[PDB]
Write a protein that binds this ligand. Sequence first.
Ligand SMILES: [Cl-]
Ligand SMILES: [Cl-]
Length: 162
Amino acid sequence: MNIFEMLRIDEGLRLKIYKDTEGYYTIGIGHLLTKSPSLNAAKSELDKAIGRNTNGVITKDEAEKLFNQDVDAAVRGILRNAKLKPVYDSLDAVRRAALINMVFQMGETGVAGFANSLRMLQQKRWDEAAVNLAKSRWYNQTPNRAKRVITTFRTGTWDAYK
Ligand SMILES: [Cl-]
Ligand SMILES: [Cl-]
């Protein structure tokens, strides 16, 4: 198991524009296109991301390419983030993956907001972090995914994904 496989399980793969858990236009493997309510705006952002007239449809290869970009951008974003980097640097390989997953889902900003949890993680108080991470809109809105990510931080194993 690795980050890519982890995220592929969490996000799924859809080759046609769809609305995510929040109602926003997405495609591929969790690639958010736009938060605007406009499907045209979403088709346009799509064509611009792929570099062709897609008509709202992409191939598997194109989805995998956006995915590679997005995973890399997330890593690079954590590393550049003064609040995130120290956490990430303090974690083992499996747990770093859990942090990446959260950033991929909610953005650097949104994750950055879990200050208390981040500090617990950095202190290696796994059980306490897990409880604190659960008191969040994130957990109440996507509880199954949330639980899988929290299990990963609590345990440091990929058990939640097997
Ligand atoms: Cl893009
Ligand atoms: Cl869920």
